[PDB]
Amino acid sequence: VGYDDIGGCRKQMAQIREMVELPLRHPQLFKAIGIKPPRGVLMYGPPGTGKTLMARAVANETGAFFFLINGPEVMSKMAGESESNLRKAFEEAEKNAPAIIFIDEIDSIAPKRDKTNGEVERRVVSQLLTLMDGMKARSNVVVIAATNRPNSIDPALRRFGRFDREVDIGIPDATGRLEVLRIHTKNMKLADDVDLEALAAETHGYVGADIASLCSEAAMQQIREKMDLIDLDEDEIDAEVLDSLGVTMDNFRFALGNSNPSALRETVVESVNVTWDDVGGLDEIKEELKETVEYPVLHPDQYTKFGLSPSKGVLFYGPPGTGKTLLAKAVATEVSANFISVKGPELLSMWYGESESNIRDIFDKARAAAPTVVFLDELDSIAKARGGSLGDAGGASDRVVNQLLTEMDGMNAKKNVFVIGATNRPDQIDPAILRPGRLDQLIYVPLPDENARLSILNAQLRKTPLEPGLELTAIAKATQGFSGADLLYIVQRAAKYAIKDSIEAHDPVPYITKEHFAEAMKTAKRSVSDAELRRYEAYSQQ
Amino acid sequence: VGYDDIGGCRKQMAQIREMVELPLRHPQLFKAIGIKPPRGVLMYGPPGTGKTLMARAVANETGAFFFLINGPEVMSKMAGESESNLRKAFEEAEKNAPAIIFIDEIDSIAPKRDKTNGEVERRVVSQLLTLMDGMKARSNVVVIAATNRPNSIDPALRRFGRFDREVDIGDATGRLEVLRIHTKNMKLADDVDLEALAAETHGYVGADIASLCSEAAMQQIREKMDLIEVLDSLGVTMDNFRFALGNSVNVTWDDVGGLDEIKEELKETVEYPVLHPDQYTKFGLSPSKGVLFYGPPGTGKTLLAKAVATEVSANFISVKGPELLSMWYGESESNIRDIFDKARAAAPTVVFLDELDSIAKARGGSLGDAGGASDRVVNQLLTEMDGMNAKKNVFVIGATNRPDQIDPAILRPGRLDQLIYVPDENARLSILNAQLRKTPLEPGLELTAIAKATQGFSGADLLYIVQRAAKYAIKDSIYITKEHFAEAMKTAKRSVSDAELRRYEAYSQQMKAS
């Protein structure tokens, strides 16, 4: 492992290389200017970005002495050995040659004083401080640290002379991810039809080890598609097939469609399968959503050419059972950006100040794996109007909405995050949310009309055997006031009658008959009420 | 143990078997493809599922060294000792030969490093992270984990290189396979049918089946040794297994009287999707899920739900209306989410929500803290019943006595599509016959006369009359005679008034007209 293994962080790599190499390769410059170089690095960032890999690279390349210290491995049973261990380690490091020290998980042996108990922790922290910067502090020794939670470190350790340059090794961009993919696939034998440039673009939040996992999974799938076809050959491996190995593009696509970024492993959404053809009617809304979603991500050069950021938020409102969550499902299924589904009251908590910690966590997750689609379902619950309630519920339900206000439009770096809202009482959300910059465009999704409802029926029966002489237009012209869910129910009842007939006969009937479908239509429902549809109509008119 | 001692977890067992053994059987393949194999597995599922059994079986089938580490065992109060214990364990595992490390219950020693306050927990977490990944971390040795809640683990631990693979180890055929493999070493009997066992024990994790078989076998000898060639003709029968099960309701399509069309509709709509998944896949459509019952109280809605739940191999989770509300902020919604997560975690399952008038309440607007709580509960219920879910197999069944106070978002098709109305002397005859199934009857009593004098009673009233007759019979003893019915008939209640009947009739007429 050398400096070429690590890719995607050329800036940070150079930032570390300068102080690790130039003082040891060309020290004439610093004596000519008469300033000693910085001596201390704190690599931070999300887990797996390549901090330990960068330490390994700088260790294997430089000819200087390298000493490894792990975090919890320094302290021992008896009182006064953690400090003795640190003393011996630093003495050995400085005894012989210019040396590099590397502390894995410095957060495990550098807790913030004034908030931790146990005297041994304080004593070892103080010993580390004295070793790194005290009287006769150091003599040509460099220290490197690696952590995932820099804020949980003693501020006395994050000072010049101890940790002066804190390099941020974070998630790569598209070019960095492309570089990571190309480096990881240098020894694995692939197929000529595999293109790395396209494959890197679909991945958005995959950082380092995530990409490695993708590669490994693809190879495993390729092994399991054809190894099973051939004899196991436990005695020996046939040479002819070994030269036939490779990885095809379909393997990479399959492995990609299963994997998710390691950051968003806890919030993984179940594999629900919907497609744009499965949503009938409301084509203009479909095209508008596609425009507002996939123009920012597929054509960012245009937006910077015009020098403007894109619009982000959308809110569907309308009568229940029309395709709001269905549109959310379709977006989640056939869009490159990551999806984080959240239910309405799912984020609220028993304790004080935890619903806001939950909101903070999910929105930081969204900003880390940008571009991302955050689908807030039933916004009418958490986004209640502030107004006046005079109660602890009012106090807690007012604090939660205020966190949402500052998270969507606050002090953030304009990262790509598209918020989709879905409510059924749009009059009961504070106007501070129904504003451009939070949810700019408010899409009303009425009940389907004759053409739209007919298209819905055609979409619903995509994979249903039907008689050649069936005329769905007639049932569509004799329906009024229905919703897509009601037509779905009609389809379900027709299928159930067909199944009843098939079981009674028991392929006696390889299709749904017009008689079965008429029997199903006999018990029409008309889910939504006309007494209550006027509320939506008045709200839209206003 | 061996691979033959595992049943039901076929696909995940095969996946773990191949991912562990392919490197061991021949590394030339991975050398040729030039990629290193996965070296970590996070098993998660309810306790007693067979996860450690699977790990042990894989370790036994291969030339490995199964080393077990318990969660609470390694954690200690001394400073710098638990980390030393983990380091010693890993050094031992890597020292001898390529081995399998099974660290059980990592959730006890992985508190996410933010919600914890003890420094030893964070220190051991960091030690685990350094051991799994780092400079020369692992050299041909794999680690297996186990937990009930996989969420309460460090994100750094659920990374690639530490726990790159997560396996869900949660049915009828697997349960039957476990029954077959757990009774392989004992000659039970010739007339014992395992279909009833695989259908009746519909809520057994898999480690409880071994206990059930052992208990039945022990009780067979316990009952066959009071008086005592003896070794000949030994083994368990159906009676021993039934007793073991006795040591989750007892109804089968008989305790309900009348309402034949309602019974047939429920039976069809519940059994069709369970018996014939192939037909629906051929037709390419999902089944209906929701049913709502409304009418006067004490009519048998709970009885009907139990009677339609019993014939299938599904579970039964009955929850009362106000039996979930709490004074805290977000506890009711947490309870609802837990209930539905349990319901969909064991498919198939029928959930019986009782007194929807208490939960739904037609949220609208109330302008109060109770109003906000009701709004949040209604929204959570709406999202869970039909939202960003998979709806594998869940049959929500509602039951209320005031459907007018329900919002038109739960009555919507796809959530509670079927609006069934539950409303006679001929029906009362069947009700009395079903109630008096196992009872010593007199030839001289005429149930027709008893039913003729009801004129608007409910099944609760009939059960009360039967209970009074039984009390009189027991008083006389300390068969049922006619004079007990004669004296018990005068003390009728007729708790259901007349105005509510008019309200129900008006609601039914409005629904029919709609």
Binding site: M78, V120, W351, D392, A393 | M78, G80, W328, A373
Partner: peptide, 23 residues
């Protein structure tokens, strides 16, 4: 001759949390 040694590892503390009531 024998010798002694001192050791002081840690202790156990108790925290207090705040809850929110929705009436």
């Amino acid at each position: 001759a024998a010798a002694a040694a001192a050791a002081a590892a840690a202790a156990a503390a108790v925290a207090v949390a705040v809850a929110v009531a929705a009436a």
